[PDB]
Amino acid sequence: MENFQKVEKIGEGTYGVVYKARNKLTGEVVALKKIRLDTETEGVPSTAIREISLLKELNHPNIVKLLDVIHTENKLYLVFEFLHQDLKKFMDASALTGIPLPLIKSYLFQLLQGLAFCHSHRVLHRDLKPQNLLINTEGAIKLADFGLARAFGVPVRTYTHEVVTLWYRAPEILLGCKYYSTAVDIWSLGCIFAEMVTRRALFPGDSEIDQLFRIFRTLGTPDEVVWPGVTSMPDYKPSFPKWARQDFSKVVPPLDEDGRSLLSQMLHYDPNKRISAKAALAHPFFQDVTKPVPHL
Amino acid sequence: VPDYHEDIHTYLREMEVKCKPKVGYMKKQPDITNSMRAILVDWLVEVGEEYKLQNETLHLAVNYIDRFLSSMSVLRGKLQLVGTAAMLLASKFEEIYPPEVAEFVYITDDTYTKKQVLRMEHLVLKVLTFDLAAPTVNQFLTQYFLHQQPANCKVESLAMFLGELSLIDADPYLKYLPSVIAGAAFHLALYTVTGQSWPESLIRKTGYTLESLKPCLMDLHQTYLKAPQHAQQSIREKYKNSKYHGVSLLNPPETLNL
Numbered sequence: 001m002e003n004f005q006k007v008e009k010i011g012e013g014t015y016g017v018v019y020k021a022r023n024k025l026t027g028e029v030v031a032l033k034k035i036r037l038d039t040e041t042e043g044v045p046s047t048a049i050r051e052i053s054l055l056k057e058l059n060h061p062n063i064v065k066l067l068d069v070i071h072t073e074n075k076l077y078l079v080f081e082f083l084h085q086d087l088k089k090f091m092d093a094s095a096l097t098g099i100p101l102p103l104i105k106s107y108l109f110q111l112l113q114g115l116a117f118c119h120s121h122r123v124l125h126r127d128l129k130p131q132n133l134l135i136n137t138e139g140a141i142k143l144a145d146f147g148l149a150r151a152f153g154v155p156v157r158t159y160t161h162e163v164v165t166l167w168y169r170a171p172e173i174l175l176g177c178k179y180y181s182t183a184v185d186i187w188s189l190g191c192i193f194a195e196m197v198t199r200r201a202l203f204p205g206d207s208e209i210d211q212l213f214r215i216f217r218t219l220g221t222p223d224e225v226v227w228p229g230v231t232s233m234p235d236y237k238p239s240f241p242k243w244a245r246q247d248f249s250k251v252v253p254p255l256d257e258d259g260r261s262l263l264s265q266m267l268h269y270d271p272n273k274r275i276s277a278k279a280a281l282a283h284p285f286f287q288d289v290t291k292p293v294p295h296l
Numbered sequence: 297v298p299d300y301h302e303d304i305h306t307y308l309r310e311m312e313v314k315c316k317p318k319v320g321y322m323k324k325q326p327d328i329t330n331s332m333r334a335i336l337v338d339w340l341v342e343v344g345e346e347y348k349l350q351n352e353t354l355h356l357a358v359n360y361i362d363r364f365l366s367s368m369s370v371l372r373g374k375l376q377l378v379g380t381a382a383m384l385l386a387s388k389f390e391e392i393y394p395p396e397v398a399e400f401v402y403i404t405d406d407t408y409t410k411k412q413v414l415r416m417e418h419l420v421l422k423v424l425t426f427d428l429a430a431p432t433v434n435q436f437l438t439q440y441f442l443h444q445q446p447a448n449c450k451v452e453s454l455a456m457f458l459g460e461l462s463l464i465d466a467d468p469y470l471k472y473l474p475s476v477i478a479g480a481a482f483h484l485a486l487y488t489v490t491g492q493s494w495p496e497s498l499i500r501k502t503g504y505t506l507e508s509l510k511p512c513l514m515d516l517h518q519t520y521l522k523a524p525q526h527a528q529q530s531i532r533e534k535y536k537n538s539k540y541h542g543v544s545l546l547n548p549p550e551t552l553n554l
């Protein structure tokens with residue numbers, strides 16, 4: 001830490017606190033994440049243990065680089081590459097005009113490459129949300145905050161009391177499934193795709209049941225033909241109202257045919273038939289992809 | 297989703313070789329023995345049972361211990377503190393929520409303080425350089441189990457029983473990679489329950505023929521034959537439960553037909 005000068009605080013949350021800092025010797029600007037560490041009581045949080053072990057395994061252009069870990073008696077610091085803001089803030093600054101379609105397309109494409117990389121290395125992210133997707137001035141976007149990430153060499157059990165985010169949560173989790181799968185990360189990215197296009201969250205629920213009903217109101221109340229097994233999922237109830245699936249031409253008006261088709265496949269109900277990251281990347285929607293730069 | 301099944305198998309095979317402990321470390325440990333280590337692992341089994349921890353947690357703890365013991369000399373009096381920190385770390389990596397540190401302190405019958413456990417957690421992380429996502433026997437078996445025709449839960453449980461046995465004795469087992477021990481386990485479980493043999497689906501996936509498996513198998517077969525007499529019994533007691541179809545009751549085949 002002797003060779004870092006803190007420059008300014010850029011965020012605080014469940015992680016810890018993140019500072020922009022500069023290496024006094026090399027001039028590199030980094031993001032320093034200080035882990036909330038109680039030395040006399042619980043030790044190193046599970047978030048830092050997961051993020052570190054997994055991020056040190058993952059080297060890819062669309063996953064935030066972890067540069068270094070500074071671990072001393074009282075303190076644990078993660079040193080990350082600096083990126084200059086999160087997608088949430090960019091969506092907010094761009095509401096009104098909207099992010100341009102080509103830049104949306106580029107971000108989707110890059111995020112799918114990052115995810116396909118995570119999934120092929122047995123890592124599930126589980127908490128994709130715009131505040132965890134980081135962008136730079138050259139058109140890159142990168143997955144960040146692997147604090148809730150899990151290795152899935154053996155199936156990951158769901159958490160009775162999910163701390164995971166509501167808005168970007170997959171239906172199979174809301175209906176009580178026992179295990180997560182890679183499919184939950186695709187569902188999230190699908191929601192984010194839609195959000196960028198429409199300039200608002202697709203499914204902004206205020207509770208778990210409201211979150212489910214909001215999904216059902218746009219995608220239709222699912223049944224055994226659309227989703228075999230649904231009816232016997234732990235929190236399925238035969239009393240759910242019946243809503244019709246909506247025309248995507250109305251869910252996401254700005255999208256063309258290829259867009260609606262990809263979106264519809266990322267938001268499939270049945271996690272077994274939900275498109276994979278690797279197959280998404282071959283979708284025709286990406287034929288004409290470029291790498292525009294954002295107006296930050 | 298099986299779009300990754302192959303890539304993941306292939307990546308586990310790469311990682312298992314990087315997370316391997318040194319096979320000869322016990323002899324260089326001036327003050328501990330294969331036998332003290334076996335006593336420690338059997339105790340962790342029991343901790344896992346008391347606190348209802350997943351099996352993966354146990355396999356990860358043992359990995360962390362053998363790697364830790366591969367570079368740090370430890371006195372027999374501190375060996376349980378190593379194990380406790382390992383189990384705490386494995387817990388945090390693998391469980392939804394870990395037992396509290398204080399629970400860990402109690403399961404040692406209060407022989408260490410809360411602070412000692414925490415400081416050891418830090419030392420273990422440093423020596424393992426935070427590389428905690430190791431492949432285990434449990435993981436490979438879980439991958440192998442997709443290839444059963446058809447699935448048979450007796451086989452599954454018995455194979456998990458044997459993989460767990462293998463943790464107790466560094467004695468032979470530190471010689472073999474986790475994918476090889478899983479292969480042996482799966483075969484010997486399949487054979488025990490049904491008389492069938494390491495399937496050609498897994499020969500192609502793993503690239504291991506039955507033959508290449510045979511050295512590990514003969515060890516595991518002896519291990520299984522001798523299990524009822526072994527000084528450490530906690531794995532047997534655990535696998536008597538109905539949860540596991542009582543497999544550790546089953547009679548081991550006196551011969552393998554090799």
Ligand SMILES: Cc1nc(C)c(-c2ccnc(Nc3ccc(N(C)C)cc3)n2)s1
Pocket residue numbers: 010011013015018031033064080081082083084085086089134144145
């Ligand atoms: C949780 C987090 N975990 C990590 C690793 C974060 C991170 C990492 C690298 N750069 C930035 N840059 C960054 C973050 C926020 C902002 N804002 C302007 C909010 C700007 C840059 N943030 S945030």
